[PDB]
Amino acid sequence: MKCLVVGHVVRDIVKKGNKVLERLGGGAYYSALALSRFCDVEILTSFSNLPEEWIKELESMAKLQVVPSETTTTYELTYLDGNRRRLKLLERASPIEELPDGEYDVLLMNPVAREVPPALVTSALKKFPFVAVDIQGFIRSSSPGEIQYQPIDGSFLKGVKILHADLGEYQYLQGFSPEFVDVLLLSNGPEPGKAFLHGREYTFEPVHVGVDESTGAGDVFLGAFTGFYSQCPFVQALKRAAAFTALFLKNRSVDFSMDDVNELAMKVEVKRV
Numbered sequence: 687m688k689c690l691v692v693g694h695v696v697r698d699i700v701k702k703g704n705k706v707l708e709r710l711g712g713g714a715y716y717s718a719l720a721l722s723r724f725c726d727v728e729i730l731t732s733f734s735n736l737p738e739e740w741i742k743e744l745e746s747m748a749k750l751q752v753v754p755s756e757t758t759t760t761y762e763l764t765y766l767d768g769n770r771r772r773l774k775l776l777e778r779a780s781p782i783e784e785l786p787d788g789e790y791d792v793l794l795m796n797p798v799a800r801e802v803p804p805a806l807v808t809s810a811l812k813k814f815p816f817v818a819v820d821i822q823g824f825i826r827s828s829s830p831g832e833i834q835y836q837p838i839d840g841s842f843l844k845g846v847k848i849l850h851a852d853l854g855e856y857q858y859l860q861g862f863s864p865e866f867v868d869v870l871l872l873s874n875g876p877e878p879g880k881a882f883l884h885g886r887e888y889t890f891e892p893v894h895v896g897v898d899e900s901t902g903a904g905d906v907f908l909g910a911f912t913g914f915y916s917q918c919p920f921v922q923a924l925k926r927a928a929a930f931t932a933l934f935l936k937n938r939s940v941d942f943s944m945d946d947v948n949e950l951a952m953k954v955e956v957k958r959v
């Protein structure tokens with residue numbers, strides 16, 4: 687199984703109380719990280735400078751296809767509480783305007799700052815047989831500074847197999863209903879989420895875990911779900927995605943056994959409404 691994940695990798699400047707660190711980030715990184723546990727991954731991205739050790743982490747999990755750039759997408763993430771963060775765009779890498787040809791079983795589009803046009807999703811749906819999308823990088827302004835949401839028309843998503851948005855983001859998706867996609871994952875941090883299978887609503891309860899930051903969890907959840915959904919029934923896939931993302935949150939290396947994911951997946955509550 688061979689997957690292409692599309693989006694900018696990000697230099698995260700992460701601020702948590704009085705502490706400051708830098709770390710690799712981005713939808714494409716975190717979704718690839720999760721999918722690396724299921725198949726061969728290639729990442730189509732753009733960046734200019736990254737730390738040698740970060741290029742090494744990315745290359746140990748995937749093949750990189752990098753659109754040349756003078757700049758690296760850089761986000762300051764100021765976490766007031768564990769899930770609540772202010773996101774500020776400080777710098778942005780190049781647009782991703784061209785897809786590669788190849789035997790890609792799955793394409794997962796996870797931009798973070800408007801680098802993938804909706805036209806490219808349209809092109810992907812024609813060139814490839816299975817498209818997954820996170821909406822986050824389609825509804826943020828690309829303008830410098832504090833992120834602002836701009837609504838978009840959602841008819842271009844018709845044909846997408848799996849779509850993830852959080853509660854707040856979903857409100858910015860207009861002309862949309864869940865049946866446009868095969869699976870709509872509507873998350874809400876540690877709080878109950880929704881999942882829709884051909885429009886049919888379910889609820890799900892994440893397992894409780896105490897985080898100081900949530901960075902990447904929605905990307906991991908989307909990537910993990912995409913992986914399990916290819917090998918499990920819908921409900922089980924959703925449980926295992928949840929457990930996977932719970933484990934990730936306390937083990938960002940994601941080097942835990944898949945057996946550990948399966949045992950904990952059983953304790954995850956899922957109901958057809």
Ligand SMILES: Nc1ncnc2c1ncn2[C@@H]1O[C@H](COP(=O)(O)OP(=O)(O)CP(=O)(O)O)[C@@H](O)[C@H]1O
Nearest residue numbers: 852873874875876892893895900902903904907931
């Ligand atoms: N505090 C927490 N405890 C346990 N699971 C959590 C969690 N926060 C997130 N998760 C899991 O990850 C999923 C996606 O998280 P979330 O809804 O926060 O993604 P997001 O894209 O909206 C923002 P972020 O990537 O910063 O988390 C949740 O549905 C849940 O299963």
Ligand SMILES: O[C@H]1[C@H](O)[C@@H](O)[C@H](O)[C@@H](O)[C@H]1O
Nearest residue numbers: 696711712713761798902905
């Ligand atoms: O590292 C992160 C993470 O990948 C988020 O899911 C994304 O929305 C942010 O912009 C990025 O800084």
Ligand SMILES: [Mg+2]
Nearest residue numbers: 822852904905
């Ligand atoms: Mg997200």
